[PDB]
């Protein structure tokens, strides 16, 4: 599923993402936008370490989900990486929440630091009714 901007904002808000661990909805929107373009089926193989990024948040197989083919990987979200490729983002959101419960918070995603941190991210949620 490729979400439309405001449709996703409300979906994330409805799922409890607005202010989760101090993270505004606009930050999640900026993350989802830069990681996958709001695409739940997005996948990216990392040849460098044999791991794969899955879904709308592009969560990694080394630490967060199990895909059975990542060497020495763990599964902190306790989910099949397949769960992160659904049109329904509830599982991806549960895992995204799990990621930020760790010290780094939203900083876990390199793309957020690069394209969202210390930036004006209001545009991602303007006019969405959130």
């Amino acid at each position: 599923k490729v979400f439309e901007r405001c449709e996703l904002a409300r979906t994330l808000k409805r799922l409890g993402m607005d202010g989760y661990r101090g993270i505004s909805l606009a930050n999640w929107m900026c993350l989802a936008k830069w990681e996958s373009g709001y695409n739940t089926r997005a996948t990216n193989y990392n040849a460098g370490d044999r791991s794969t990024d899955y879904g709308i948040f592009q969560i990694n197989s080394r630490y967060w989900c199990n895909d059975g083919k990542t060497p020495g990987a763990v599964n902190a979200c306790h989910l099949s990486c397949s769960a992160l490729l659904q049109d329904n983002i509830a599982d991806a959101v549960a895992c995204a929440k799990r990621v930020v419960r760790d010290p780094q918070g939203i900083r876990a995603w390199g793309a957020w630091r690069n394209r969202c941190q210390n930036r004006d991210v209001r545009q991602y949620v303007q006019g969405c009714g959130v």
Side-chain angles (χ1 to χ4, degrees), residues 59-126:
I59 289 166
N60 192 255
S61 61
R62 183 151 293 296
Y63 327 87
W64 316 104
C65 65
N66 181 48
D67 64 358
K69 62 177 174 196
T70 309
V74 292
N75 179 13
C77 296
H78 290 99
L79 290 171
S80 164
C81 292
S82 174
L84 308 182
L85 302 176
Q86 293 178 86
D87 278 5
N88 180 291
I89 66 173
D91 287 331
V93 163
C95 188
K97 292 181 173 182
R98 171 64 186 81
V99 180
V100 303
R101 287 201 292 278
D102 275 9
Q104 280 183 305
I106 190 75
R107 283 159 167 80
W109 287 272
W112 180 85
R113 296 192 209 168
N114 304 359
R115 320 206 152 229
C116 307
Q117 176 178 189
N118 303 150
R119 310 256 199 170
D120 183 347
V121 295
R122 295 174 306 135
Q123 68 185 304
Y124 298 104
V125 299
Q126 300 307 274

Side-chain angles (χ1 to χ4, degrees), residues 5-103:
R5 189 179 63 93
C6 292
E7 187 213 328
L8 177 61
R10 291 188 294 267
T11 304
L12 293 173
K13 191 178 190 172
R14 215 143 43 210
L15 287 159
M17 291 289 263
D18 200 357
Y20 185 80
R21 294 284 149 121
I23 301 159
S24 70
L25 186 57
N27 277 295
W28 291 119
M29 289 295 292
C30 181
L31 175 70
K33 169 79 171 186
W34 287 113
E35 287 293 351
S36 68
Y38 310 144
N39 183 6
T40 63
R41 289 183 58 255
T43 62
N44 170 70
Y45 179 62
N46 298 305
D49 77 321
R50 298 184 173 201
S51 68
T52 304
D53 299 329
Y54 296 88
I56 192 173
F57 293 128
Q58 287 291 276
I59 289 166
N60 192 255
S61 61
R62 183 151 293 296
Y63 327 87
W64 316 104
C65 65
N66 181 48
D67 64 358
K69 62 177 174 196
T70 309
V74 292
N75 179 13
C77 296
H78 290 99
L79 290 171
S80 164
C81 292
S82 174
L84 308 182
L85 302 176
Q86 293 178 86
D87 278 5
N88 180 291
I89 66 173
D91 287 331
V93 163
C95 188
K97 292 181 173 182
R98 171 64 186 81
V99 180
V100 303
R101 287 201 292 278
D102 275 9

